[PDB]
Amino acid sequence: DEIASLLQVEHLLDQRWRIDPSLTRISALMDLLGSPQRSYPSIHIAGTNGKTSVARMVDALVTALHRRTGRTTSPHLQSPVERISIDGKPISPAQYVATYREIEPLVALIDQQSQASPAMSKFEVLTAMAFAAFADAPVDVAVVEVGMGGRWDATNVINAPVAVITPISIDHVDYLGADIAGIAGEKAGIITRAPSPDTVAVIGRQVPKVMEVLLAESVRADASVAREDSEFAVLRRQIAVGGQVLQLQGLGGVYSDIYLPLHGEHQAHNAVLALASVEAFFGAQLDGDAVRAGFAAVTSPGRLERMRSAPTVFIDAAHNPAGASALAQTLAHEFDFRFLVGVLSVLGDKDVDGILAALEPVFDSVVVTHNGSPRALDVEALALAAGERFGPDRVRTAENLRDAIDVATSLVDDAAADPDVAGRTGIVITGSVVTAGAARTLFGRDPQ
């Protein structure tokens, strides 16, 4: 019945689905709520890739330093409870429902005042729920991931003392040409002038035109800036059983023998970015044992996460060229597979061709399918896209994800039976958050 109540809430929220760049609705709602989102400090995270992983690393580090955290991330993989976490764990379905019920009369009032002056969007309501729940807990620090962009995102009502910008590239596609400067500018909108110490902008690796824009906006916000490879850096990294071992230069010095239980060079970069952000937040050197303990406790469900071995099955949320490239490089560099089959479903607003082109060098073949989202590309369209990069001989189709996994499985069994192929095989389920999340539920894992 807890689960059932949660389903009732989601059914309503899903009926909501216009933009409000002035942040009028969510600002009004926060006023009615008593401005809960101003009653704790936040670390605020924007960018194209690594936002969620960095958010979870920040949470882990702040928790290892023994402050009580709240964390809001998006999208969710399996259950919307994942979007609001306290003390490093999703809240329960009962708490999620109680949070919605407690703000609902004020949400209804904004919905009505708005339509008498558009309803509030589902993201606006989720964001208000996270902020209310953080004040209900209460937390010492909130870690807040942008839903989309930054400047006009519903989370952008917090004036965060630390703003973090992870690597920026293309993800959502409106045009063939890219306004990388306009893209950078929107995300920079979370770097705000402090009322207090000046805001700190902590910036991961960027292309030059992006960096220029971010530095300009940091100047407009009076923000201090820390940049990867100038103020902090990954110094050394070794692959290790279960992940990797790092030596990081943070803002307060060198931290050594950091074991991070996640695969991928990109996760090393997300780690040092998270470290510099937590250092900035506390004014850092941080206790090195607490930094080692926080990193060791990091999870990032659905980011190159292994569901089993013999055969190995990975799930990965990659849904843009930069992420599919990080995934392909990790599979090639940190493992020794003799045969890999991809199981793929991708949403229609992504750079599908860029995703396939990054994965073609590592997937011996691919099974394309539909992950159940209304926004997913249909199987026939994805099959043709795949065919253009893989050749039709390396492409198969399946009506749904469970079928697609069964197809991949028989391909990997055949490879295993093929003396000059794999007589060290794996299946990689990717292409979307929804694809990764649905697969995670098929493999029976609880939301994290």
Using CB under 5 A, which of 124, 171, 305, 364 touches Mg ion? 171
Q: How far is the CB of 442 from ligand ADP (least distance, A)?
A: 18
Binding part of the chain for ligand ADP, among 34-42, 57-65, 319-327, 411-419 by CB under 6 A, reads 319-327
Torsion over CA: 308, 309, 313, 316 (sign): positive
Binding partner of residue 174 among Co ion, ligand ADP, Mg ion, none, CB cut-off 5 to 8 Å per kind: Co ion
Give the one entry of Mg ion, Co ion, ligand ADP, none that residue 127 binds, where binding means its C-beta sits below a cut-off of 5 to 8 angstroms depending on kind: none
- Give least dist CB 433 to Mg ion, A: 8
Locate 39 and state its tokens: 């009653």
432 is a contact residue toward Co ion (CB under 5 A): no
49 in a labelled binding site: yes
Q: Which stretch binds ligand ADP (CB under 6 A): 189-197, 311-319, 341-349, 379-387?
A: 311-319
- Tell whether residue 171 is among the known ligand binding residues: yes
Which residues contact residue 24 at a Cβ distance below 8 angstroms, ignoring those fewer than 6 apart?
A: none
Query: Among residues 148 and 245, whose Cβ is nearest to ligand ADP?
Result: 148
Spatial distance between the Cα atoms of 261 and 54, rounded to a whole number of angstroms = 14
Using the minimum distance from each CB to Mg ion, give the nearer residue, 146 or 234: 146
Q: How far is the CB of 319 from Mg ion (least distance, A)?
A: 6
- Beta strands 233-240 and 243-250, pairing class: antiparallel
**Residue 250 makes contact with ligand ADP by CB under 6 A:** no
Classify 243 in phi/psi space as left (phi over 0), alpha (psi -120 to 50) or beta.
left
Of 361, 398, 399, the residue nearest 411 (C-alpha): 398
What is the rounded CA–CA span in Å between residue 74 and residue 66? 24
Q: Is 187 annotated as a binding residue?
A: no
Residue 131 CB contacts under 8 Å (≥ 6 apart), including other chains:
30, 33, 36, 37, 72, 142, 158
Which region among 42-50, 95-103, 207-215, 223-231 touches ligand ADP (by CB under 6 A)?
A: 42-50
Compute φ and ψ for 198, nearest 5 degrees.
Answer: -65, 155
323 lines the binding site for ligand ADP (CB under 6 A)? yes
Q: Are strands 253-260 and 243-250 parallel, antiparallel or unpaired?
A: antiparallel
Residues 285, 287, 291: CA angle, nearest 5 degrees: 105
Contact assessment for residue 59 and residue 68, using Cβ atoms and an 8 Å cutoff: no
Confirm whether residue 35 is marked as ligand binding.
no
Tell which one of 82, 124, 279, 316 touches ligand ADP (CB under 6 A). 316
420 binds Co ion (CB under 5 A): yes
Residue 289 as a binder of Co ion (CB under 5 A): the answer is yes
269 part of the interface to ligand ADP, by CB under 6 A: yes
Residue selected from 167, 252, 301, 311 as contacting ligand ADP according to rule CB under 6 A: 167
Which CB, 145 or 171, lies closer to Mg ion?
171
Provide the annotated binding site for Mg(2+).
171, 319
**Residues in contact with ligand ADP by the rule CB under 6 A:** 47, 49-53, 166-167, 266, 269-270, 303, 316-318, 322-323, 326-327
> Which residues are part of a known binding site for ADP?
49-53, 270, 303, 316
